[PDB]
Design an enzyme around this catalytic site. Structure first.
Site, PDB file in Angstrom:
ATOM      1  N   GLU A   1     -62.325 -42.690  53.822  1.00 52.27           N
ATOM      2  CA  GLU A   1     -63.720 -42.731  53.388  1.00 52.27           C
ATOM      3  C   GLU A   1     -64.615 -42.604  54.611  1.00 52.27           C
ATOM      4  O   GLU A   1     -64.976 -43.594  55.246  1.00 52.27           O
ATOM      5  CB  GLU A   1     -64.011 -44.020  52.630  1.00 52.27           C
ATOM      6  N   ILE A   2     -64.981 -41.367  54.950  1.00 49.55           N
ATOM      7  CA  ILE A   2     -65.993 -41.166  55.977  1.00 49.55           C
ATOM      8  C   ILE A   2     -67.302 -41.769  55.492  1.00 49.55           C
ATOM      9  O   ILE A   2     -67.735 -41.530  54.359  1.00 49.55           O
ATOM     10  CB  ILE A   2     -66.133 -39.674  56.318  1.00 49.55           C
ATOM     11  N   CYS A   3     -67.927 -42.576  56.341  1.00 47.93           N
ATOM     12  CA  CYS A   3     -69.100 -43.347  55.955  1.00 47.93           C
ATOM     13  C   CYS A   3     -70.366 -42.649  56.433  1.00 47.93           C
ATOM     14  O   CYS A   3     -70.433 -42.183  57.576  1.00 47.93           O
ATOM     15  CB  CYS A   3     -69.028 -44.771  56.514  1.00 47.93           C
ATOM     16  N   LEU A   4     -71.353 -42.562  55.545  1.00 44.58           N
ATOM     17  CA  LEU A   4     -72.674 -42.034  55.859  1.00 44.58           C
ATOM     18  C   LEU A   4     -73.692 -43.119  55.547  1.00 44.58           C
ATOM     19  O   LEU A   4     -73.706 -43.656  54.434  1.00 44.58           O
ATOM     20  CB  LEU A   4     -72.974 -40.770  55.051  1.00 44.58           C
TER      21      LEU A   4
END
Ligand SMILES: [Zn+2]
Ligand SMILES: [Zn+2]
Ligand SMILES: [Zn+2]
Ligand SMILES: [Zn+2]
Ligand SMILES: [Zn+2]
Ligand SMILES: [Zn+2]
Ligand SMILES: [Zn+2]
Lengths: 1731, 153, 75, 71
Positions: free
Chosen positions: B84-87
């Site tokens: 889960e790449i976080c933005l």
């Protein structure tokens, strides 16, 4: 004769006067002290002059305040106090005028000029023999050091010193004083004898009074207080009075005494709060005692109470015990005499400032002679010893030879007491004892016992002010006196031990000691150090410091070890003691004349005794289990002192190298023997692992281990200085080198153990210590330890296996290696692989660097090679700037700046900076990549694969061979010693072969590649060493019996997944190299275990990438998945202005654009008849260094008006559309003031807003054609606007009304002017728009193609112009034109409202008057031309000066020639009868050029107006502007001067040429702005013309002439270098460290809204925006000689040239009013606190 | 629904012009979810590495950035262990004009140089800062796994 | 020498940039054409970022190349 | 499984916390051992805030690790 007796009688009777007899209150101390100062000054100045008549030769005869004589009448006239207290006499002695230019002429004698605060120090880094030799302003000659590193430093409070001009020993090259580049009354015998008498009497009185001042002594004050207490409770006041009378100052010229007082003394025990509490508890009667008394203690001492009756004061005197402040009880007469001596010292200091050179050269010499003469009067003066003997017999031991100096008291007969002298006997120098070497203590010494010695010995009795004054008056005067310098050195050395013991044990405020100044100004001299070394006094100094150190020693492991101070040291005296002693030793060693001197038996044993206490003094244990709660701080002191010792050793090495004469080898051998024997005397546990292998038992993970081992470092040095065989011979016969090398290897093992994070359970302190041990700033500890290990291996030619077993034992790898424990369950747990990696690196380091065993041509070449290697291993990772390169390289390498620069130039190539804010970088030469070994010691910080891959990439011919190339190990035997060639013995042994085999086998089995690359590189290095030793095709037999080639073959024939390509490629290379050497003996080994068909296929496998199939399948997978994605997209599609918040809403709410509305400093009038203003054509930006920065009064007033007057405001914006509702929400939520805020997109500062309407050209036929040829009525363009709505119309009304009300960008003058309504805003908005257009033109002047410069690269500016035009048009259309009934700026006959009034009228006529533009331009241009021609022709100062003015213009440039038709036209416009020459064409030509140049800005601004008009009416986004069928850029690119003017007239005017325009009749219209048209600046508007080199503003500030600001222009403002420079006006601003660092220059005398100031010292320019208090610092547009900018450029004093492009960028930032925006953008989130 | 039209013209932009090494497509039943592709750049350690992405879009796409998760094994300092790449700056008060192609290109750019400050895989960050051996080897093996992971949805 | 630049939305920006020009000057041209601050822009070519201190030639930029703009992802 | 947590003052606390535990569980352990309010503190790992919902394995924290704790 009688003068001495008279002086004694007068001085010894101050208390006898009735004025001083009675004690007085604190406010009456001040006037009494002033009276004492005046009386002492007057009396001593009268006496020092011959009978009191020689004063006028010194002081001014008739000063100010004359009208009561200037000088005293006679002796009685100077001694009386009735005149002094009546304020009748005048301070004649004061010489505080402007005539004091400190003009001092000296020849050979030192300048000795003390440095005031703010004065520069010119420490040349090449001429100075050391780092202490400085120079003063008047003694600095910049011609001497063209191309030197001159580090200019600014003197501060704590920085005290003297100049050193004329000291031939202190400068490597002769220097010339700047002065030398350009009836005597004080030289007769009578006057010098008289001044000698006065000074001798003064010093004798001083010594006599302070010799009896034992009350404030730190050693005795305690029992003085105790005894006084005892006599006050036991109630026996008779002996109390007797004691007080005994302590009272005495002279020969009820029962309780009187006239007594209580005095406290300053200290560092307590801060202000505790002292104030003690004072408040002391005497509540003292008003404001917590306020007034506390600050006086901050400067020396203070008196808190005084009264005649002792009973009252004594009760309050006992505040000593409350807080421990050293408070003493003193008589009033004693205090009077102490104050008298303080003012005497002040007078002596003042006498040194008299401008009379002869008086100074006599006074200083006689004062030095009196100070250095033997102190007589010792017998006559009262002996104070009987009192302390009688009252304190308990603390006074009769038989002790040190009974006196232990109490800081002189001896009987007033002699210097006996110090703790310790001379060592020669019979005790044979060996170094484990404890302190045996010494003898003499019980008799013959001191000179002079006045200076007494003054220095009494240094613990004074107060801070009197102390500092005494050092400032004695140390510089004697030190600078070339006649009395050696005598001063001898006198202070003879008493050195007393001073050191005083400052250590008996001193209230040790940090104020005189010894620091004494050593700094005395021992830093080759002659003094040579004289000290010639005697045994150096040994006495060393042993005094050793005695200071030995009090904190401890016994640990059979040796004496220093320990951190744990005793109560609230005075902190021991830290100063240690620092001063170590600095003294280092300084004395640094200036040794003969390098053999420190190595002589006595000297070497004393130095080693000093350095032994810190040998392994610091021990750490690996914490296990729970992490340490708090980080250890104890290591700091050990770091400091061991750094001092390391610097001592490095300085010894440096002086050995620099001195031309070598050192006798016998001394080196003796030193090696001594140190080796001492270190072998250690006790170490032993153990046996096999039957006949014995190694030391020591578990690093469990037991204490030390980083810093100075004695081993010295041993490595000494062994390096001599041959290996001689070093072995000097070793003791009964000794084991492993005993002395195991500690170094322990340090190495501990460093590698903590590197892998094994000691994480200890705090970060241990990591800091480890990183300090690596790349130690002062010395190479790690490299020396590796050298010691190499020596241990090389000197064990009998039991080589024992070494390898021991070496591998300390790493705790022996449990794994012997098979005792498995690989996975070693003590290191999972970190075993990293430890083995470090171990392989350690072995490779042992094998590879033979630098210490090489023999170079000279030590200079050795240092050069060290520098080159350090630079190479610091650069190849990436190109780096000079500052970062200096930061990386160890400090002891960079000190010789010239050598470092030479090596850097030879090694790398300079890469010029490309951007506008980047440092020049250095790129390592490609040819030197072949010399980088990524495993050697220098690359310890980095990993192995990363350096390997970087070197491979820089060594591969293409990207194909990134991982197909191998790194040759750097092993060589060039210029190597004969005995050093056998370092490969331990690698070629069977045990190490088994070690390598086991490591490779476990690597294969567990499949870990962490240490595999290092191991392959190590094997390659072993093979290379064997080939270098034996010769061609040689292989070590050890790796043949044990079949390692099978393991390498298993590495090579892997699955290409367990190991990377670099491992596989390297292994095959090793196989091929060794197989090619001998295939027959090697092919048998392979078939022995792997069968035959593997080997036979291997040759078939050889001579025929693997990943090409992998890449092909990856590409096929990519194609398949992208086809799948495209199919998914196709089936999915077969299945089926920008706001800030309301995206895609298409709301009709108006987009309000934030903007900046403020004044500009670019508007200035241009005086006519100025060739510098109108003649020189502008080829873009430039800078003339030859002309100094300067401003004219009218121009300065113009800038001040621009700052103040609101008629010069300009709109500048970012063009970021925002809803009005969204903007309101932004204002409310973020709480910015509506007046000033920041744009929510670019964060840029903004204060005013202006909406943009939905413009459109639909259903109309507008163009520029009918704009030129027909009316430009503002409604004829407002017809573009779309039809509006009632809701929209009322919204427009509301928003415009609120913008009018809430915006302060509108001028208050027109706001308050009569008949001002909301319909008049259009006029001032048009005025601001014209001002913005003028700004655009002024900025465009800076570009090379000035004809079309304003067209290019101004897209955002053009957008701002279009926005402003649309907004004002919307305002006018909605509200309505005012019919020009009201004039915002009346044509006053005395003031100029706008500097661009011509273009202002042009705008007013074009926008408002419904008439053709082409006729308005002609009208305005004709009227201005007529005005200018009348002014120029009817001007004066030219009728007889036309010729010289024409000559000056021709010198500046070329004057255009006027044709006969233009002659007739100009004559018709106006003719002059002053033409007295044969041909009057000169004045006509001058008028032609002047009118053309004056008009050109107006023409260009008209073209800009046409451009914005086209942009408003453009059909398409890419539509080139065309006029009358011609492109403006094409038709104006190559047009110059008159041709350009005529083409522009054809383009924009209804006329056809300048002649045709002049032919037009004199049409007169009464527009307000056409009467008396002001003339603006014609030439390039920019910042000041900075000098070529920033060194001029620092080095040659005296030479450069600059305009100065009178604000606080006093207090040596003619020589201080604290100033800035204003780039806007050139007015230098002095920083006096007061009043907000002199930010007042914005509020007055310059442009107020913003400005840019240059700081030459830091080489950075600062930008200030005055609306908030904010300001920023940016690098000045100055580029260092070595590519550097910012503060790093000026440091080290490099030449700092000027970069034109950066300065032009700064100018373009300033002109376009982007400076406030730049400042707002820099802070970002920080700017919010302002609002 | 404004979000639906937003995704529609995002898809139009993708179908017309797709940034090199990046491709995406939504699903028919739910256009909100997406499947995205990223190719590691040429000079990066992720060379020729193709990695799938999954983007579950919140209903208020203009206000809230989509929830993004990797569908293949990833070893990157800025990528969580769950993929889960976080933005977190895409949801700020003033976000710049962005579409799915923009964020995909941002991820592709991040694939070359990581952001050591505020990392997601702490061991990956420590491995990148020093001791690059395991980092590069793990990147290579993740590339191999992503290549091997043949998908058949 | 001509290059193309695509903004975050996808609008193509036409630029004429010298081969020796720096990336900081390129971002200056971007903000000149549009108005997005240079410190708010990152350029990527072939999926790799661009740093301010190196020229266009050093990054292998040919005629009519395409340079993209990306987000920040400081989180 | 030991991880060291550095507080504001400088003191460091070692926790025998399993990777499967949550960040909120780490805060609970810190509170239980020192009586510090978990709400005020914000455990940050090398410049990244830690979410109480996620686990230690989610951030992939293992073996020795320094976790600065800012109130
Ligand atoms: Zn010099
Ligand atoms: Zn001089
Ligand atoms: Zn001087
Ligand atoms: Zn909106
Ligand atoms: Zn903006
Ligand atoms: Zn100024
Ligand atoms: Zn230099």
């Amino acid at each position: 004769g009688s003068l001495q007796g008279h002086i004694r009688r007068t001085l010894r009777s101050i208390h006898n006067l009735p004025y001083f007899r009675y004690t007085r209150g604190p406010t009456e101390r001040a006037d009494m002290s002033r009276a004492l100062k005046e009386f002492i000054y007057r009396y001593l100045y009268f006496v020092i002059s011959n009978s009191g008549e020689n004063l006028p030769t010194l002081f001014n005869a008739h000063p100010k305040q004359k009208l009561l004589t200037v000088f005293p009448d006679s002796l009685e006239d100077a001694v009386d106090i009735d005149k002094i207290t009546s304020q009748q006499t005048i301070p004649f002695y004061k010489i505080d005028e402007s005539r004091i230019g400190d003009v001092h002429k000296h020849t050979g004698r030192n300048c000795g000029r003390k440095f005031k605060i703010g004065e520069p120090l010119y420490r040349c880094h090449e001429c100075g023999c050391d780092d202490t030799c400085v120079l003063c302003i008047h003694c600095f000659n910049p011609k001497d050091h063209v191309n030197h590193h001159v580090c200019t430093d600014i003197c501060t409070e704590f920085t005290s010193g003297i100049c050193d001009c004329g000291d031939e020993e202190a400068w490597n090259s002769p220097l010339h004083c700047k002065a030398e580049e350009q009836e005597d009354v004080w030289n007769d015998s009578v006057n010098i004898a008289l001044v000698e008498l006065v000074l001798a009497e003064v010093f004798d009185y001083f010594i006599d009074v302070f010799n009896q001042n034992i009350e404030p002594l730190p050693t005795i004050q305690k029992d003085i207080t105790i005894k006084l207490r005892e006599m006050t409770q036991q109630g026996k006041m008779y002996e109390r009075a007797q004691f007080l009378n005994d302590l009272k100052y005495e002279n020969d010229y009820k029962i309780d005494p009187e006239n007594y007082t209580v005095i406290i003394y300053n200290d560092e025990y307590h801060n202000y709060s505790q002292a104030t509490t003690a004072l408040r508890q002391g005497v509540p009667d003292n008003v404001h005692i917590d306020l007034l008394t506390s600050r006086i203690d901050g400067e020396g001492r203070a008196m808190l109470k005084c009264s005649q009756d002792l009973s009252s004061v004594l009760g309050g005197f006992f505040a000593v015990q409350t807080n421990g402040l050293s408070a003493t009880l003193t008589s009033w007469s004693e205090y009077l005499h102490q104050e008298t001596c303080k003012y005497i010292i002040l007078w002596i200091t003042h006498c040194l400032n008299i401008p009379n050179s002869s008086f100074q050269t006599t006074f200083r010499n006689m004062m030095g002679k009196t100070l250095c003469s033997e102190y007589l009067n010792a017998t006559e003066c009262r002996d104070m010893t009987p009192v302390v003997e009688k009252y304190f017999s308990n603390k006074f031991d009769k038989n002790d030879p040190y009974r006196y100096i232990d109490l800081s008291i002189l001896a009987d007969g007033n002699q210097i007491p006996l110090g703790h002298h310790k001379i060592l006997p020669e019979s005790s120098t044979h060996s170094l004892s484990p404890l302190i070497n045996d010494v003898e203590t003499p019980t008799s010494r013959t001191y000179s016992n002079t006045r200076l010695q007494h003054i220095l010995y009494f240094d613990n009795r004074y107060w801070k002010r009197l102390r500092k004054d005494i050092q400032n008056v004695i140390i510089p005067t004697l030190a600078s006196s070339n006649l009395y310098k050696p005598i001063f050195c001898q006198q202070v050395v003879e008493i050195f031990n007393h001073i050191t013991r005083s400052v250590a044990y008996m001193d209230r405020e040790p940090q104020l000691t005189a010894i620091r100044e004494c050593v700094v100004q005395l021992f830093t001299c080759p002659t003094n150090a040579k004289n000290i070394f010639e005697n045994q006094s150096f040994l006495d100094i060393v042993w005094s410091i050793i005695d200071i150190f030995k009090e904190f020693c401890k016994v640990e492991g059979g040796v004496l070890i220093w320990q951190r101070v744990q005793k109560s040291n609230l005075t902190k005296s021991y830290s100063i003691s240690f620092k001063q002693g170590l600095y003294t030793v280092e300084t004395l060693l640094s200036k040794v004349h003969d390098p053999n001197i420190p190595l002589r038996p006595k000297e070497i044993i004393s130095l080693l005794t000093l350095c032994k206490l810190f040998n392994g003094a610091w021990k750490i244990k690996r914490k296990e289990g729970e992490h340490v709660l708090h980080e250890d701080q104890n290591f700091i002191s050990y770091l400091e002192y061991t750094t001092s010792i390391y610097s001592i050793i490095q300085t010894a090495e440096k002086v050995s190298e620099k001195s031309k004469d070598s050192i006798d080898s016998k001394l080196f051998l003796n030193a090696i023997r001594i140190i080796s024997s001492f270190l072998g005397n250690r006790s170490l546990t032993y153990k046996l692992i096999y039957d006949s292998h014995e190694v030391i038992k020591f578990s690093v993970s469990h037991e204490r281990v030390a980083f810093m081992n100075p004695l081993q470092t010295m041993l490595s040095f000494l062994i390096e200085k001599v041959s290996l065989k001689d070093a072995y011979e000097a070793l003791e016969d009964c000794s084991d080198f492993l005993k002395i090398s195991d500690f170094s290897l322990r340090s190495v093992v501990l460093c590698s153990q903590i590197d892998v994070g094994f000691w994480v359970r200890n705090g970060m302190s241990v990591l800091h210590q480890a990183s300090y041990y690596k790349n130690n700033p002062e010395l190479g500890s790690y490299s020396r330890d590796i050298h010691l290990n190499q020596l241990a291996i090389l000197w064990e030619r009998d039991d080589i296996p024992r070494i390898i077993y021991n070496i591998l034992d300390r790493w705790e790898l022996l449990d794994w290696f012997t098979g005792e424990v498995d690989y996975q369950h070693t003590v290191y747990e999972d970190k075993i692989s990293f430890i083995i990696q470090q171990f392989i690196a350690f072995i490779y380091q042992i094998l590879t660097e033979r630098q210490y065993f090489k023999t170079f041509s000279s030590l200079k070449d050795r240092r050069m090679d060290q520098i080159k290697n350090s630079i190479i291993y610091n650069l190849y990772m990436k190109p780096l700037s000079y500052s970062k390169l200096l930061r990386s390289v160890p400090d002891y390498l960079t000190e010789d700046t010239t050598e470092f620069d030479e090596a850097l130039e030879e090694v790398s190539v300079f890469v010029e900076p490309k951007g506008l804010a980047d440092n020049g970088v250095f790129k390592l030469k490609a040819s030197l990549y072949a010399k980088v070994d990524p495993l050697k010691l220098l690359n310890l910080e980095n990993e192995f694969e990363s350096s390997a891959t970087i070197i491979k990439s820089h060594l591969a011919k293409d990207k194909d061979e990134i991982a197909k190339v191998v790194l040759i190990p750097q092993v060589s035997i060039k210029q190597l010693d004969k005995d050093a060639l056998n370092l490969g013995a331990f690698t070629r042994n069977t045990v190490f072969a088994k070690v390598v085999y086991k490591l490779l086998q476990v690597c294969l089995d567990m499949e870990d590649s962490t240490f595999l690359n290092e191991l392959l590189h190590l094997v390659h290095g072993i093979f290379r060493d064997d080939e270098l030793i034996n010769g061609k095709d040689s292989i070590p037999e050890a790796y043949l019996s044990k079949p390692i080639c099978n393991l390498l073959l298993s590495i090579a024939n892997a699955k290409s997944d367990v190991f990377s390509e670099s491992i596989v490629r390297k292994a095959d290379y090793l196989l091929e190299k060794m197989i090619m050497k001998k295939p027959n003996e090697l092919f048998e080994s392979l078939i022995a275990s792997f069968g035959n068909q593997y080997v036979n296929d291997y040759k078939d496998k050889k001579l025929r990438t693997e990943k090409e199939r992998k890449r092909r399948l990856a590409k096929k997978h990519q194609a398949r998945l992208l086809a799948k994605f495209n199919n998914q997209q196709t089936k999915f599609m077969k299945e089926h202005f920008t706001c800030a918040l309301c995206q895609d809403s298409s709301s009709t709410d108006f987009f309000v654009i934030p903007a900046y509305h403020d004044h500009s400093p670019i508007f200035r009038p241009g005086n006519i008849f100025n060739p510098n203003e109108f003649m020189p054509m502008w080829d873009g930006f430039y800078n003339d260094d030859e002309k100094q920065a300067y401003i004219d009064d009218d121009v300065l007033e113009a800038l001040k008006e621009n700052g103040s007057c609101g008629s010069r405001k300009v709109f500048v914006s970012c063009n970021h559309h925002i809803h009005h509702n969204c903007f309101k929400r932004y204002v409310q939520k973020k709480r910015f003031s509506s007046n000033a805020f920041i744009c929510p997109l670019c964060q840029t500062f903004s204060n005013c807003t202006l909406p943009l309407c939905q413009t459109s050209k639909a259903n109309t036929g507008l163009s520029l054609d009918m704009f030129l040829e027909s009316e430009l009525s503002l409604d004829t363009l407002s017809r573009l606007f779309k039809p509006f709505t009632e809701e929209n119309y009322r919204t427009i009304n509301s928003i415009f009304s609120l913008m009018i009300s809430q915006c302060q960008g509108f001028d208050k003058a027109v706001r308050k002017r009569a008949n001002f309504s909301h319909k008049d805003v259009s006029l001032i908005l048009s005025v601001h728009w014209a001002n913005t257009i003028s700004m655009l033109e002024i900025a465009s002047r800076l570009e090379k193609p000035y004809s079309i410069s304003f067209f290019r690269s101004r897209e955002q500016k053009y957008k701002t112009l279009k926005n402003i035009l649309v907004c004002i048009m919307l305002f006018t259309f909605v509200i309505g034109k005012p019919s020009m009934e009201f004039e915002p700026y009346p044509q006053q006959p005395d003031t100029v409202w706008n500097q661009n009034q011509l273009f202002q009228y042009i705008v007013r006529s074009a926008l408002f008057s419904p008439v053709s533009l082409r006729q308005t331009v002609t009208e305005a241009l004709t009227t201005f031309s007529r005005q200018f021609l009348r002014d120029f022709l009817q001007g004066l100062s030219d009728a007889e000066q036309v010729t010289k003015l024409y000559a000056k213009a021709s010198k500046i440039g070329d004057v255009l020639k006027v044709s006969e038709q233009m002659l007739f036209a100009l004559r018709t416009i106006s003719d002059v009868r002053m033409e007295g020459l044969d041909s009057e064409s000169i004045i006509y030509d001058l008028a032609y050029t002047f009118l053309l140049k004056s008009l050109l800005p107006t023409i260009r601004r008209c073209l800009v107006f046409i451009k914005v008009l086209h942009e408003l009416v453009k059909d398409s986004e890419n539509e080139t502007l065309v006029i009358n069928g011609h492109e403006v850029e094409e038709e104006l690119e190559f047009e110059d001067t008159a041709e350009f003017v005529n083409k522009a007239l054809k383009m924009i005017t209804e006329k056809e040429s300048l002649v045709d325009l002049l032919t037009t009749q004199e049409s007169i219209v009464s527009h307000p702005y056409l009467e008396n048209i002001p003339y603006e600046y014609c030439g390039i508007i920019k910042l000041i013309d900075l000098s070529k080199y920033l060194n001029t503003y620092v080095t040659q500030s005296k030479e450069i002439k600059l305009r100065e600001e009178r604000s606080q222009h006093m207090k040596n403002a003619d020589n201080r270098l604290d100033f800035k420079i204003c780039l806007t006006c050139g007015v230098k601003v002095h920083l006096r460290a007061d009043r907000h660092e002199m930010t007042k220059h914005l509020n007055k005398n310059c442009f107020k809204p913003f400005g840019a100031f240059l700081m030459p010292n830091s080489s950075e320019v600062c930008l200030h925006l005055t609306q908030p208090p904010s300001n920023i610092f940016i690098s000045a547009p100055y580029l260092n000689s070595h590519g550097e900018v910012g503060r790093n450029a000026m440091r080290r004093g490099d030449l700092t040239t000027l970069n034109l492009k950066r300065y032009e960028h700064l100018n373009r930032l300033w002109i376009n009013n982007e400076i406030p925006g730049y400042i707002s953008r820099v802070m970002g989130d920080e700017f919010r606190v302002t609002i | 629904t404004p979000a639906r039209r937003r995704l529609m013209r995002d898809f139009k932009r993708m179908k017309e012009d797709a940034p090199p090494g990046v491709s995406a497509s939504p699903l028919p039943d739910n256009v909100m979810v997406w499947n995205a592709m990223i190719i590691g750049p040429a000079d990066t350690p992720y060379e020729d590495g193709t990695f799938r992405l999954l983007l579950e879009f919140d209903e208020e796409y203009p206000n809230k950035p989509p929830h993004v998760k990797f569908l293949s094994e990833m070893f990157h300092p800025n990528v969580y262990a769950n993929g889960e790449i976080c933005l977190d700056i895409l949801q700020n008060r003033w976000t710049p004009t962005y579409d799915v192609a923009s964020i995909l290109t941002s991820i592709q750019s991040l694939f070359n140089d990581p952001n050591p400050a505020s990392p997601a895989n702490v061991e990956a960050a420590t491995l990148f800062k020093d001791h690059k051996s395991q980092y590069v080897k793990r990147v290579k093996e993740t590339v191999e796994k992503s290549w091997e992971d043949d998908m058949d949805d | 020498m001509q290059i193309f630049v695509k903004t975050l939305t996808g609008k193509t920006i036409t630029l004429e940039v010298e081969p020796s020009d720096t990336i900081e000057n390129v971002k200056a041209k971007i903000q000149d054409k549009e108005g997005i601050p240079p410190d708010q822009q990152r350029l990527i070519f072939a999926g790799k970022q661009l740093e301010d201190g190196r020229t266009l030639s050093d990054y292998n930029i040919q005629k009519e190349s395409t340079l993209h703009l990306v987000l920040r992802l400081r989180g």
